[PDB]
Write a protein that binds this ligand. Structure first.
Ligand code: HEM
Length: 422
């Protein structure tokens, strides 16, 4: 809709106008948000902010915002100081289920290392090969369904493609039958929508669906203990590292992590990638003329530009002094990947969406280290394949309206993105 010039810096946002602890700030467009973190990186690279308070329930204590690329990298490579426990968000609303929803992402070593090592062993060559074919199969069918279901040539990219694609791939690797997709999608959408303030989500309904998807996953894992199949669920019950195996409860907790951390992340990377290729058509023309050649750099820039995960929280176990800022033990620390992927000291011309950007030390998958995104390369494959099928079946697809943004501090979400093709 609105015309954009590639390489346009964000507006000058004064420091007095930045309120990271107010929900009003997170309702602004990306230009004001980018300009706010740009002012932070320049004038207050590490500052303390209160949490977002909804009038009524508790809010918790504040957090130190790390906006520089080096500070986020330093915090990611020192997990003994920046703990991932109890959780990785600013305020956990259900701390008794922190490990039930989080699985390995809320654990520290050695508990994190033992759990991740066994899960990584379950991704055998046979399981990965099925996952790769599923990415191509699902992306091809979803794009082809867009053409059939919309003879008018107009559709919403989120509901038709960017939404179901990451979750259908997760259901395929877990061996979930096609008839059970209705339950898995509904259960996941209620879980994701529970954080959305715009959608009234009943807390009692949130607990019911969280236990239902957990019971479905434990029963799915128990079924694979008797009936071997070529899915990830079977390999999860058979994987063993140093005599340690996974219980059905642990597998269910990992499945609940995937339907969130491995679902809405890739979704918003696709939507923002389509929005970037639409606002800067010279980049879509470059990639379309040499897709397999520019795919690696284009996917990496889409992740840097989108930054689907806005931040990740850490908890200090000891006192820290970085850039003259003295942070005490027990304080919360938030690693703002949205700001690090625009760091002027790390990226030349950071406001240019360049599908050929090299080098690209982007931290959209995190700053590296122990908790580095387990499905980072799978996410890269999902981004490349979905834009490959769009290039083949509807090469002129383009966004025709400004996106409907998700009101979130943790997810750079797009709720609706109208697109059109010929
Ligand atoms: C654009 C897509 C994605 C983005 C931007 C993303 C982002 C992230 C980030 C920022 C972290 C935390 C890194 C850290 O704390 O240092 C993470 C962890 C994780 N991601 Fe992703 N992710 C994506 C897709 C996926 C997919 C497709 C999967 C699985 C199929 C996945 C599975 C995981 C898991 C299991 C963890 C926790 C690993 C651990 O705690 O050791 N992610 N992701």
């Amino acid at each position: 809709l609105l015309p954009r010039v590639n390489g346009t810096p964000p507006p000058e946002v004064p420091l007095a106008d930045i309120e990271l602890g107010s929900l009003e700030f997170w309702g602004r467009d990306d230009d004001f948000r980018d300009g706010a973190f740009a002012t932070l990186r320049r004038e207050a690279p590490i500052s303390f902010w209160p949490p977002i308070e909804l009038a009524g329930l508790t809010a918790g204590k504040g957090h130190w915002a790390l906006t520089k690329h080096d500070d986020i990298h330093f915090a990611s490579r020192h997990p003994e100081i920046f703990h991932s426990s109890p959780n990785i968000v600013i305020h956990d609303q259900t701390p008794e289920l922190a490990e039930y929803f989080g699985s390995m992402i809320v654990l520290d070593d050695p508990r994190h290392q033992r759990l991740r090592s066994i899960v990584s062993r379950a991704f055998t060559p046979k399981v990965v090969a099925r996952i790769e074919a599923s990415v191509r199969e699902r992306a091809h069918r979803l794009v082809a369904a867009m053409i059939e279901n919309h003879p008018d040539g107009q559709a919403d990219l989120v509901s038709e493609l960017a939404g179901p694609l990451p979750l259908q791939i997760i259901c395929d690797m877990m061996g979930i039958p096609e008839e059970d997709h209705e339950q898995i999608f509904h259960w996941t959408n209620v879980i994701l929508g529970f954080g959305d303030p715009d959608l009234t989500t009943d807390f009692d309904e949130f607990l019911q669906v969280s236990m239902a998807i957990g019971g479905y996953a434990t029963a799915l894992a128990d079924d694979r203990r008797v009936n071997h199949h070529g899915d990830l669920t079977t390999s999860l019950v058979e994987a063993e590292v140093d005599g340690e195996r996974l219980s059905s409860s642990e597998i269910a907790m990992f499945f609940i992590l995937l339907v969130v951390a491995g679902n809405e992340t890739t979704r918003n990377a696709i939507s923002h990638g389509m929005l970037a290729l639409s606002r800067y058509p010279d980049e879509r023309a470059k990639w379309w003329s040499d897709f397999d050649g520019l795919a690696a750099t284009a996917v990496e820039e889409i992740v840097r530009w989108a930054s689907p995960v806005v931040y990740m929280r850490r908890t200090l176990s000891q006192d820290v002094d970085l850039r003259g800022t003295k942070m005490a033990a027990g304080d919360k620390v938030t690693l703002w990947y949205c700001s690090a992927n625009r760091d002027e000291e790390k990226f030349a011309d950071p406001w240019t969406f360049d599908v050929t950007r090299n080098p690209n030390p982007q931290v959209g998958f995190g700053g590296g280290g122990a908790h580095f995104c387990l499905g980072a390369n799978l996410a890269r494959r999902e981004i490349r394949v979905v834009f490959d099928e769009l290039r083949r079946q509807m090469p002129d697809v383009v966004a025709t309206e400004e996106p409907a943004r998700l009101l979130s501090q943790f997810i750079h979400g797009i709720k609706r993105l109208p697109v059109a093709w010929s």
